[PDB]
């Protein structure tokens, strides 16, 4: 029932009606019909943004620090694998940092949830009542102070599509870090260098067959 004008993950394939292009990155991909129920699809829409946005930050935070180290830039945290940052010693114990993390995140996340439950109800500063977000914001897209440079005032639809495409790719990349790190046992950029050294004999088929 989905129209053929919209982009399709599989050209010439029938696609669900409930994926009608409203959401960004709507390519009609749902072989398991997870998002069939509108109430559930409403939740999954926000979950994708949240998992995606954190993934984009996480991937950026796993490649750039390693990229700088190879270039030779020196900082005390240089040369630490992304899966060894936890063991590293900081100014405060890991437990104390974790406790502060949850208290800070509890405020913002509940603030974000309140808007999702009732959009527009969490757009006012509790202390300085003069401050406020624009009233037209939708769940997942606060705007206002969260968009200081006004990029959202342009072609918003294209920007939403660009965000979700980069986000979806970022989420796949992080799963690659876990799979590659757990198998190869080395940092991600090291795996890329090995592949570029000999692309033909360094496939996962070569690597995994050797192990077993």
């Amino acid at each position: 029932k989905r129209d053929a004008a919209l982009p399709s993950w599989m050209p010439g394939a029938d696609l669900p009606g409930y994926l009608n292009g409203t959401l960004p990155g709507d390519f009609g991909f749902d072989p398991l019909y997870l998002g069939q129920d509108p109430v559930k699809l409403k939740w999954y829409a926000q979950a994708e943004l949240m998992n995606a946005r954190f993934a984009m930050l996480a991937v950026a935070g796993i490649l750039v620090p390693e990229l700088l180290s190879n270039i030779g830039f020196s900082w005390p945290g240089a040369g630490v694998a992304w899966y060894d940052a936890g063991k590293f010693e900081y100014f405060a114990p890991a437990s104390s940092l974790f406790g502060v993390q949850m208290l800070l995140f509890a405020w913002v996340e509940i603030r974000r949830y309140q808007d999702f439950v009732k959009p527009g109800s969490a757009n006012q500063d509790p202390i300085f009542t003069n401050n406020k977000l624009p009233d037209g914001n939708e769940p997942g897209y606060p705007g206002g102070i969260f968009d200081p440079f006004g990029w959202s005032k342009g072609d918003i639809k294209s920007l939403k599509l660009k965000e979700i495409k980069n986000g979806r790719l970022a989420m796949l990349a992080f799963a690659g870090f876990i799979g590659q790190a757990y198998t190869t046992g080395t940092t991600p950029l090291k795996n890329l260098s090995t592949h570029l050294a000999d692309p033909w004999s360094t496939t996962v088929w070569q690597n995994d067959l050797a192990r077993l």
Partner: protein, 230 residues
């Protein structure tokens, strides 16, 4: 009204001559179902087209490269890309090509558009006969060409099977086997090297090694249905 495989016979009802190469041969009636015939039509073209390319290659290999046995070309060939490097490219490239062809068979006219470049597109066509970029040049009438394609194709499919059984029995290439036949035509026929009668059965020996060692692994290499050979 049209030439038939067995002249003087009546072609089955489901065969009427519409398709190219339709000579009314269907003793088992596998094409009776309309949808089944549509699928079987595609597979015959694909099988024939692969066979024609394969048969031509084997002949050219022997002429150009007589030393290498086309049967053993799998292990004989050495390239920097390695075994699994070649397979990886082959899998992904073939998966894309075959799926698109498969999609057109299911829902024709849906995979004609070029994904990357918008302007380019495939003109309307029949299933199994793509046009445009695939057919820059046409010598003559398509109807005549289609009949030529299948008739050569059907012969090629038999030809390849001839190579395999001749290769497994005589342990030689296609041209090399033919030269043997011309040398002693009477003593080289399959009748002159095998025979079964009540109480005795003589069969040729499989001249392909039982197993092949290839880069630290053993690849089984069984002769096709060697137990049922004459």
């Amino acid at each position: 009204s049209r030439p038939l495989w067995l002249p003087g016979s009546t072609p089955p009802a489901h065969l009427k001559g519409d398709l190219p190469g339709d000579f009314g041969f269907d003793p088992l009636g596998l094409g009776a179902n309309a949808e089944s015939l549509k699928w079987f039509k595609e597979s015959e073209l694909v099988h024939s087209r692969w066979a024609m390319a394969a048969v031509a290659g084997i002949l050219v290999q022997e002429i150009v490269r007589p030393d290498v046995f086309w049967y053993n070309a799998g292990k004989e060939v050495e390239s920097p890309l390695g075994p699994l490097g070649l397979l990886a490219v082959e899998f992904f490239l073939m998966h894309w090509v075959e799926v698109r062809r498969w999609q057109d068979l299911r829902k024709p006219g849906s995979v004609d558009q070029d994904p990357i470049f918008s302007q380019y597109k495939l003109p309307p066509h029949e299933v199994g006969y793509p046009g445009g970029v695939f057919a820059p040049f046409i010598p003559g009438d398509l109807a005549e060409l289609k009949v030529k394609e299948i008739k050569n194709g059907r012969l090629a499919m038999l030809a390849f099977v001839g190579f395999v059984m001749a290769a497994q029995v005589t342990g030689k290439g296609p041209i090399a086997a033919l030269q043997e036949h011309l040398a002693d035509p009477w003593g080289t026929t399959i009748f002159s090297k095998a025979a079964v009668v009540p109480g005795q059965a003589v069969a040729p020996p499989c001249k392909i090694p039982a197993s092949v060692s290839y880069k630290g692994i053993e690849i089984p290499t069984p002769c096709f249905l060697q137990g049922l050979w004459p």
